[PDB]
Structure 1
Amino acid sequence: TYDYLFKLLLIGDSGVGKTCVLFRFSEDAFNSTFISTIGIDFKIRTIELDGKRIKLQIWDTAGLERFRTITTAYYRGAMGIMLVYDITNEKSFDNIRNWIRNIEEHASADVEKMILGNKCDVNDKRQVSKERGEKLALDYGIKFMETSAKANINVENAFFTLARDIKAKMDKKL
Structure 2
Amino acid sequence: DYLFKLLLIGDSGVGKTCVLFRFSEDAFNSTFISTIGIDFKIRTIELDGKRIKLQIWDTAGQERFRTITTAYYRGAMGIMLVYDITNEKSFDNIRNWIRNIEEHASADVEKMILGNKCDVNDKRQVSKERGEKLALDYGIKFMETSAKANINVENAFFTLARDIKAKMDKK
For normalisation by structure 2, the TM-score amounts to 0.98
Runs of 4+ in 1 over 3 A off after TM superposition: none
Q: In structure 2, how many angstroms separate the alpha carbons of the residues matched to 1:71 and 1:158?
A: 24
Note the C-alpha offset of 1:62. Answer: 0.8
Alpha carbons 1:61, 1:71 under 8 Å: kept: no
Task: Point out where structure 1 has 5 or more consecutive residues left out of the alignment.
Answer: none
Q: In structure 1, how many angstroms separate the alpha carbons of the residues matched to 2:154 and 2:92?
A: 25
Note the C-alpha offset of 1:69. Answer: 4.1
Q: In structure 1, how many angstroms separate the alpha carbons of the residues matched to 2:143 and 2:33?
A: 25
Structure 1 range deviating more: 67-76 or 158-167:
67-76
Q: In structure 2, how many angstroms separate the alpha carbons of the residues matched to 1:98 and 1:69?
A: 12
Q: Which of 122, 125, 134 matches 1:124? A: 122
Note the C-alpha offset of 1:67. Answer: 3.3
Cα offsets for 1:104-124 (capped at 9, x unmatched):
110000100000000000001
Q: In structure 1, how many angstroms separate the alpha carbons of the residues matched to 2:144 and 2:119?
A: 9
Q: In structure 2, how many angstroms separate the alpha carbons of the residues matched to 1:81 and 1:102?
A: 12
For normalisation by structure 1, the TM-score amounts to 0.96
Please state whether the residue corresponding to 2:64 is helix, strand or coil.
helix
Please state whether the residue corresponding to 2:112 is helix, strand or coil.
strand
Q: In structure 2, how many angstroms separate the alpha carbons of the residues matched to 1:67 and 1:60?
A: 15
CA separation of 1:34 and 1:123: change in aligned 2, threshold 3 A: same
Alpha carbons 1:39, 1:71 under 8 Å: kept: no
Q: How many residues align?
A: 171
Q: Which of 11, 24, 29 matches 2:27? A: 29
Q: Which residue of 1 aligns with 2:87?
A: 89
Q: Which residue of 2 aligns with 1:111?
A: 109
Q: In structure 1, how many angstroms separate the alpha carbons of the residues matched to 2:30 and 2:20?
A: 14
Q: In structure 1, how many angstroms separate the alpha carbons of the residues matched to 2:55 and 2:90?
A: 25
Note the C-alpha offset of 1:70. Answer: 4.9
Identity %: 99
Alpha carbons 1:114, 1:142 under 8 Å: kept: yes
Alpha carbons 1:62, 1:71 under 8 Å: kept: no
Note the C-alpha offset of 1:73. Answer: 1.6
